[PDB]
């Protein structure tokens with residue numbers, strides 16, 4: 002019902018798509034939710050669509066300074082997050098021969114290093130506040146599938162899974178758990194506006210289950226991972242893709 | 249709310265340990281729970297302990313006739329299951345050199361074949377009633393770890409995972425999902441009664457978080473897998489072990 | 496010759512298909528090869544195809560007595576195996592609704608329990624002769640894919656993988672390693688003669704590299720696993736399928 | 743033995759440890775080997791040590807210009823590589839609270855981005871010649887274990903695995919395969935000089951097999967992956983750790 006009442010959750014990349022849906026679900030669970038995105042206008046719209054439980058604070062997760070200020074404002078408002086959802090990422094469609102060093106560095110910088118910058122500051126905030134926290138990072142089932150046209154992205158998401166596995170070991174002693182979710186193809190705004198939108202016919206045929214994946218399919222799983230019901234799960238990756246791959 | 253209100257769930261091996269806790273949790277969730285176990289007296293006491301939401305029906309999962317009777321009665325009383333939790337198993341402690349054909353067959357027959365027998369009848373019942381269904385099978389993280397002193401058991405639990413993956417593919421078109429859970433070492437009645445009770449020191453040493461795993465640790469995850477929140481998950485395995493291994 | 500010179504390798508189910516190709520390759524590697532199969536005449540033909548390094552001994556891997564005689568004969572011929580290749584299995588094509596308990600037991604009985612019977616006697620033979628040993632079991636990438644029309648088979652192969660992981664733990668102390676190979680679809684005598692033959696179009700599309708898999712593709716990896724180059728590998732599963740799934 | 747006659751292989755980070763051992767083994771297989779390292783003097787000594795067809799060319803894998811120079815010289819000397827082994831990396835020991843952005847960026851930059859830089863150039867070279875190549879990247883079993891005191895490293899190596907899985911898909915059409923190897927703790931010169939050297943006691947106890955892993959244990963597996971025996975394997979990860987974890 003309101004299992005998250007009295008908890009504070011930060012969701013990055015929450016202006017639209019999966020992050021917005023995650024933010025909305027955690028608010029419905031009762032959490033105070035910080036809606037954060039590099040898109041300030043989008044973050045405000047998202048927090049407004051969710052209601053009084055949500056506040057928009059813009060941040061670029063690849064900018065250490067931006068992240069510092071984000072967490073400072075959160076500390077001032079709430080006394081510190083209990084839940085971190087690392088959702089922000091660029092989701093590119095780049096043919097392998099167009100994957101040059103500039104592109105590679107860009108994706109690694111945001112998707113992987115940004116995830117570290119945010120996790121560093123966030124779990125540090127959890128520990129300072131004596132809170133038994135939950136870190137939930139959004140990876141991708143492309144890591145299992147080896148999906149084409151996103152080579153740097155697949156590398157980055159593999160980095161996120163590796164990071165999650167190491168982090169669980171490092172933070173268990175502080176009563177913090179770290180888990181990852183690997184969504185399959187999801188009909189988010191970002192995917193709808195991308196060449197990946199064209200993959201739905203193929204992917205749906207490969208799924209065990211019918212229909213296009215929706216942001217809510219992922220949000221509802223993250224809800225579980227943020228709850229006390231998942232307290233014995235740490236260092237794990239949960240795959241949510243209607244059966245496209247098996248993990 | 250009580251999210252499982254109006255739903256019927258069958259939990260096998262529910263007289264004690266993880267099974268009883270699963271049954272208790274699903275009832276708390278608002279389900280009508282069929283508490284089934286080969287131990288008829290134990291099944292009765294478990295259902296009594298849980299409340300009016302719970303009904304005991306004894307069954308030997310390795311016995312096709314026993315299982316048929318089980319499901320015939322459930323059909324008569326409820327109109328058919330919505331949720332199947334395959335929990336029943338023998339959990340041995342047997343040195344490799346003592347793993348003979350007789351032992352091997354016994355473990356496979358109950359833990360793997362029994363699981364097929366129940367799932368065959370159970371999913372047929374769902375389909376006949378035209379119900380969206382959820383099949384949740386309890387495996388073991390020994391499949392990932394390669395734990396000694398339980399070779400036949402590890403083999404059988406691998407089979408449960410394999411069966412789960414194939415089942416998800418076969419049943420998705422009928423709106424039935426199938427997932428597995430791999431508990432780590434749990435302080436259940438059965439474990440407390442075996443040499444596995446002495447393995448907690450070594451196991452806790454390997455966990456990211458300290459403490460002995462409890463039946464409720466598993467029950468709470470099964471609750472999630474039984475719910476609408478897990479609807480986009482099928483063919484997957486969720487490892488619940490305080491980080492002893494990483495899946 | 497060269498590298499397995501002096502070594503004795505037992506290959507079960509080696510009258511045709513992958514088993515035959517494995518036997519041929521290990522002979523080429525220099526091992527004395529025991530070609531075993533339930534089809535006594537097929538085993539004799541397969542040995543003759545290989546030459547002086549092969550002896551045929553009929554055996555039904557699911558029959559404890561037959562396996563016992565098999566190993567007694569091998570001990571006399573060679574002084575005991577150094578290498579066990581568990582290749583025998585039934586590869587069915589069976590729609591889910593046709594998977595009944597009789598079919599399930601048959602598949603489990605041969606593919607999983609037979610695998611146990613042979614490995615029990617084989618590894619016991621290794622230890623009695625004080626030989627370092629190598630156990631290599633052929634599973635299937637269907638365990639990873641959740642391939643339809645073979646539910647009991649996928650369960651059994653999941654069993655073989657779990658057994659492998661446990662066995663590695665049990666036997667390492669005796670300097671015996673145990674690994675598994677998961678072939679993708681292979682154009683073997685058996686597959687040629689079954690409805691799986693029609694799966695090449697779909698499988699090839701999923702492969703990173705094109706072409707129908709051949710028995711030699713598997714035989715050449717088994718060769719590696721049988722050799723000293725693999726000496727630091729135990730408890731592992733090597734997937735050989737031109738990239739249909741990623742392990 | 744001479745199975746790589748006529749083939750050219752590049753091994754990065756080959757001045758010592760696993761890299762030098764890999765270089766030595768491929769040379770023994772008959773390949774023309776380019777021994778590359780950032781340690782220019784060490785690379786020279788290692789190539790001269792190996793003799794046979796080995797030549798040294800210094801390069802920093804994280805420096806795009808350095809790598810371009812490396813490959814230009816290889817092309818001039820040999821007509822281009824057939825085999826790429828991505829072995830160079832930094833192996834840190836850093837407590838979590840000492841993992842800051844500078845440390846993180848450096849480990850990602852060399853271990854993950856350096857791997858991309860070299861692979862980009864190396865596979866472009868393969869394709870320019872129309873060769874059916876082999877990419878083999880050395881990851882780490884720390885990705886499976888979530889090992890402490892190397893959070894950025896574990897993330898980087900997960901990235902290498904992800905990269906490998908995507909690359910296999912991208913280059914299959916050009917008949918190039920891409921696989922990864924995950925060594926366990928190995929007694930390389932680097933490790934002997936690291937605080938990681940102190941983990942041997944615990945690790946050997948967790949292994950199914952006895953003894954400290956050696957560079958040769960890894961070199962002999964890479965030899966296999968570079969050969970035609972591995973031709974049907976792509977997108978895969980082979981774990982080589984005497985059974986410390988199970989993959």
Ligand SMILES: NC(=O)c1ccc[n+]([C@@H]2O[C@H](COP(=O)([O-])OP(=O)(O)OC[C@H]3O[C@@H](n4cnc5c(N)ncnc54)[C@H](O)[C@@H]3O)[C@@H](O)[C@H]2O)c1
Pocket residue numbers: 013014015016017018019020037038039040043060061062063087088089090091092111115139140141142183184185186187188189190191192
């Ligand atoms: N949609 C899918 O098919 C799918 C599949 C697998 C994984 N994912 C993952 O789910 C998450 C969300 O994906 P989505 O489809 O909702 O994407 P989306 O494009 O719809 O939304 C991504 C959001 O992240 C924000 N963002 C980008 N860079 C940022 C940065 N530097 N700092 C802060 N915010 C930034 C964008 O502004 C955008 O609002 C991502 O981690 C993505 O990799 C998505």
Ligand SMILES: NC(=O)c1ccc[n+]([C@@H]2O[C@H](COP(=O)([O-])OP(=O)(O)OC[C@H]3O[C@@H](n4cnc5c(N)ncnc54)[C@H](O)[C@@H]3O)[C@@H](O)[C@H]2O)c1
Pocket residue numbers: 260261262263264265266267284285286287290307308309310334335336337338339358362386387388389430431432433434435436437438439
């Ligand atoms: N306890 C653990 O450390 C652990 C770890 C991983 C997985 N598991 C799994 O959890 C499940 C429950 O384990 P537990 O520790 O609670 O066991 P337990 O011994 O405490 O309870 C097992 C129950 O199963 C019943 N049972 C045995 N054979 C049966 C059959 N033929 N038909 C019907 N019921 C039968 C027993 O009567 C008993 O009531 C099993 O699947 C087990 O493999 C347990």
Ligand SMILES: NC(=O)c1ccc[n+]([C@@H]2O[C@H](COP(=O)([O-])OP(=O)(O)OC[C@H]3O[C@@H](n4cnc5c(N)ncnc54)[C@H](O)[C@@H]3O)[C@@H](O)[C@H]2O)c1
Pocket residue numbers: 507508509510511512513514531532533534537554555556557581582583584585586605609633634635636677678679680681682683684685686
């Ligand atoms: N061919 C494929 O696409 C494929 C894919 C993945 C795994 N596999 C595995 O490879 C192995 C060989 O497959 P194949 O395609 O060559 O099969 P096949 O049908 O061509 O040959 C199987 C052999 O096993 C023998 N056999 C059956 N039951 C036996 C028993 N009870 N005792 C002794 N021998 C018995 C048969 O007589 C036959 O000679 C099997 O383990 C199979 O599961 C095959």
Ligand SMILES: NC(=O)c1ccc[n+]([C@@H]2O[C@H](COP(=O)([O-])OP(=O)(O)OC[C@H]3O[C@@H](n4cnc5c(N)ncnc54)[C@H](O)[C@@H]3O)[C@@H](O)[C@H]2O)c1
Pocket residue numbers: 754755756757758759760761778779780781784801802803804828829830831832833852856880881882883924925926927928929930931932933
């Ligand atoms: N030794 C282990 O226990 C272990 C375990 C798992 C994986 N690995 C991996 O094996 C590989 C080799 O490890 P090792 O133990 O032999 O290391 P090592 O330290 O002994 O040798 C590494 C070599 O890489 C070179 N190098 C470092 N940075 C470079 C760069 N910028 N460009 C080019 N060369 C560079 C060094 O000069 C050194 O010669 C690494 O990828 C490592 O991550 C090692």
